[PDB]
């Protein structure tokens, strides 16, 4: 009968730090009618061995704020990406209040809702549960504060053989304010290098190194010779360079003009994959690689780019204009193109009787001296994911973007205490995150590129409600606008 909290949504900009509070209204049904239930592919029919899974479904729900737009309004995002060279979370504050427990009775043929109980909520800060917040699932807080949202169910996959389980599988029976401290992670880079990796040279001055210009004098027999030249501004492809572009694993090139595509079903057969334990798994999104060569921007790598759906997009077999295809154009400078080879290598030893033969490199692992940019983060895209706990990993930053962590924000589980009686709950959730910023000190003379909302005339206002009250985000928003030297 007396309020347990207030309504906090706003963003403070203090110096180099940003404090973004967000509050929403939530609704928690009762999943599995207070049960734990085995699930597997066989319940769903399990036709393919690639999709074969085994696991349990639990009544609990979980709060997931893991997407950026939960914490930033499009203005705060524009304000963030335009004025900063980097950001990263510092502290996390979380509060849960205004709990309301309703009971639904059916009297005659009509339903009645009246007050009633307790609500179970706890966090797993020892990371003893499976961590499902990193898969970019749904059920996160709505981008728009006036939306009331439903809490997702919590279930976890374990070791499987086809549909069947194995002796090494585990079963987890999961049987208000707190604060959090993010572990130290590198500042996400939100700038586009002005210079390409190959052009780092001084254009006015020669190198003192020599290369092999001519292996023959002219057309004829026994014309072999060795001639050398100075590598310089006239021919820049041959200069010696200290650093080389990052790794690549090639993607198939799909074109958004459909008549250029091959007339066959190459969607699954064609696609890049990584086999594990006999289960072919698509490579998505894959290593961070540019989407296309300049001018080829109509092409996009098959599996290699985050695709977000527009507001209202159907679930299955939607057209191309119902989905928003992001593209890593900004990182083209230091990274190979996803649809192109990493280079060529010599396949044999030349001699008098044999020509020098080279061949393509389709995939290339790390070599010493490689440099690369990671994949961008978006208004929609994820914030963090938990680094798998293993003996080893390399550059743990996740492939879908964001901040890879060995101790991410804990899972927050909630369910309605059983009494059965048809019951559900609702309330308010406020999550506060402190961010830290890195200012651009650049002395670049000409004006930067900035993210601007084009002055347009249209029926509706972008990033705002339409006549029926449906908030909508028009396009995926990148974080990379300002520039820095390579």
């Amino acid at each position: 009968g007396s309020s347990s909290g207030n309504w906090h949504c706003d963003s403070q900009w203090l110096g180099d730090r940003v404090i973004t509070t967000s509050t929403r209204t939530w609704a928690l049904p009762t999943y599995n009618n207070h049960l734990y239930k085995q699930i597997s592919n066989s319940t769903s029919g399990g036709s393919s061995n690639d999709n074969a899974y085994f696991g349990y479904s639990t009544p609990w729900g979980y709060f997931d704020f893991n997407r950026f737009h939960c914490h930033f309004s499009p203005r705060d995002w524009q304000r963030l990406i335009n004025n900063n060279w980097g950001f990263r979370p510092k502290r996390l504050n979380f509060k849960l209040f205004n709990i309301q427990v309703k009971e639904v009775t059916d009297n005659n043929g009509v339903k009645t809702i009246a007050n009633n109980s307790t609500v179970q909520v706890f966090t797993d800060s020892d990371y003893q549960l499976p961590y499902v917040l990193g898969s970019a699932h749904e059920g996160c807080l709505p981008p728009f504060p006036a939306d009331v949202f439903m809490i997702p169910q919590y279930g976890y996959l374990t070791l499987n053989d086809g549909s069947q389980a194995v002796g090494r599988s585990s079963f987890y029976c999961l049987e208000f304010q707190f604060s959090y401290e993010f572990e130290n992670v590198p500042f996400h880079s939100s700038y586009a290098h002005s210079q390409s990796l190959d052009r780092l040279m001084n254009p006015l001055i020669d190198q003192y190194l020599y290369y092999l210009s001519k292996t023959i004098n002219g057309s004829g027999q026994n014309q072999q010779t060795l001639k050398f030249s100075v590598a310089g501004p006239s021919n820049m492809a041959v200069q010696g360079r200290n650093y080389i572009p990052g790794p690549s694993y090639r993607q198939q090139r799909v074109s958004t003009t459909v008549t250029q595509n091959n007339n066959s079903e190459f969607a699954w057969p064609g696609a890049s994959s990584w086999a594990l334990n006999g289960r072919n798994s698509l490579m998505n999104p894959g290593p961070a690689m540019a989407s296309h060569k300049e001018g080829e921007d109509r092409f996009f790598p098959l599996s290699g780019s985050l695709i977000f759906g527009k507001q209202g997009t159907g679930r299955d077999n939607v057209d191309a204009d119902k989905v928003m295809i992001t593209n890593e154009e900004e990182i083209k400078t230091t990274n190979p193109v996803a649809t192109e080879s990493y280079g060529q290598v010599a396949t044999n030893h030349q001699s008098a009787q044999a020509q020098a033969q080279t061949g393509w490199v389709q995939n290339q692992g790390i070599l010493p001296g490689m440099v690369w940019q990671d994949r961008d983060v978006y208004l929609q895209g994820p914030i963090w994911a938990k680094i798998p706990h293993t003996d080893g990993n390399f550059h743990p930053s996740p492939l879908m973007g964001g901040f890879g962590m060995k101790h991410p924000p804990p899972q927050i589980l909630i369910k309605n205490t059983p009494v059965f009686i048809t019951q559900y709950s609702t309330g308010q959730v406020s999550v506060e995150i402190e961010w830290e910023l890195q200012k651009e000190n650049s002395k670049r003379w000409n004006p930067e590129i900035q993210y601007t909302s084009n002055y347009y005339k249209s029926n509706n206002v972008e990033f705002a409600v339409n006549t029926e009250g449906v908030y909508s985000e028009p396009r995926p928003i990148g974080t990379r606008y300002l520039t820095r030297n390579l």
Epitope: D321, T452, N454, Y455, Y456, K457, S458, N459
Partner: antibody, heavy 128, light 109 residues
Amino acid sequence: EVQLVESGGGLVKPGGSLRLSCAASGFMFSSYSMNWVRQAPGKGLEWVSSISRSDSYIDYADSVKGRFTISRDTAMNVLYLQMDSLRAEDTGVYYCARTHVFNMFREVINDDYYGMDVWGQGTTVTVS
Amino acid sequence: SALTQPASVSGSPGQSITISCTGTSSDFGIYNSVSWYQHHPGKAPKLMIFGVSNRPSGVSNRFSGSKSGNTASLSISGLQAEDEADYYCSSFTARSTVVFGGGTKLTVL
């Protein structure tokens, strides 16, 4: 993916009248100029008429002036060219293009012209 | 009309090609506008060059342009079989009309 699809091309005796529509999709249709061009059989492209961003300025090629009326409904993005008093020279393939401006917020009143940006495949209008 | 452009040009693969259209009075290239279009038969024409030489996002680097005095010219390099199309030049005019040249069909051998 920005697409403009022309429609309504057909066969009409001289002196008749044809209405051509251009269905715009994928972009804001009311923020751009839109205009019609014409390719006669065995000839290069020719320009017909235009309509501004706020519909204030309607322009016409000298030849078709007074015989055509360009206008856009805007309730549902579409474009309309009313062809009246057709001649034998009005045979061709009509295209629907949109002049492309990178920034719609003008900084200066006289802006250097940048040309058409998105085109349709065009429809064939034939007179007999 | 009003922009004189050669009937057809041709070149072998790999060779550069200069297509050039000329115009009369002042209004040729009034403001910055001299614009080059690529028209494949039966498909939508593309704006190869906007401005005297600026080229849009979609266009390949091979295409280029310049305007010297009264003459503007489109220069195609690294010629290929896919560059075979019709090429038109256009310029905004003082009455806020656009004017297309007759156009050059480039047949690569």
